[PDB]
Write a protein that binds this ligand. Structure first.
Ligand SMILES: Nc1ncnc2c1nc(Br)n2[C@@H]1O[C@H](COP(=O)(O)OP(=O)(O)OC[C@H]2O[C@@H](O)[C@H](O)[C@@H]2O)[C@@H](O)[C@H]1O
Length: 171
């Protein structure tokens, strides 16, 4: 497991690839895929829906059951559930929905959950439906995470922008 290939090494522990996270997960068989979740684990568009659909909706049913007996998550919080056919585990992480005025500082809280895991396959938290700048999310990630994080960015134009921006700001 955890056979990541073709990543660009950004820091000693952060790696980035222009790849759909679902197909990376099928290729790599990671111990942990990260899901960019909301506090009720209602997997809408974005990564959550793609992950859910690849589990034939088993992730959404598992999430319903988790929520029924544990209640919703906190922004910046997380929960480990099954990774189903994609990974051993899925780490569901709630970044701030910046479009709704939730504290963007909670992005640091969200990425801090990655530190509980040796190696993760992850998307950029809050950078899509939740409206954070993807460059800011990559920055928080490289600043906050100390464990090995392999970031999947499916859109080639965004990936190119992220690498360029990371170079310039790394100085
Ligand atoms: N197949 C893919 N492989 C790789 N990267 C992907 C893929 N698809 C997308 Br899209 N991305 C990119 O991963 C980033 C995060 O976007 P996101 O919307 O999934 O996560 P949040 O902004 O935290 O919103 C959470 C809310 O969205 C609902 O899904 C969830 O239930 C919740 O209510 C963005 O850069 C986006 O371009």
């Amino acid at each position: 497991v955890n056979s990541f290939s073709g990543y660009l090494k950004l820091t000693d522990n952060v790696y980035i690839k222009n790849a759909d996270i679902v197909e990376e997960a099928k290729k790599v068989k990671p111990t942990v895929v990260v899901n960019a979740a909301n506090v009720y684990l209602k997997h809408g568009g974005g990564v959550a829906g793609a992950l859910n659909k690849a589990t034939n909706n088993a992730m959404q049913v598992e999430s319903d059951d988790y929520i029924a007996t544990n209640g919703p998550l906190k922004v910046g919080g997380s929960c480990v559930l099954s990774g189903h056919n994609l990974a051993k585990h899925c780490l569901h992480v709630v970044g701030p929905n910046v479009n709704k005025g939730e504290d963007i500082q909670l992005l640091k809280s969200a990425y801090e959950n990655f530190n509980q895991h040796e190696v993760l396959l992850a998307p950029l938290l809050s950078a899509g439906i939740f409206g954070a700048d993807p460059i800011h999310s990559l920055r928080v990630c490289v600043d906050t995470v100390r464990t090995n994080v392999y970031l999947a960015v499916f859109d080639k134009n965004l990936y190119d922008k992220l690498v360029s921006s990371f170079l310039e700001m790394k100085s």
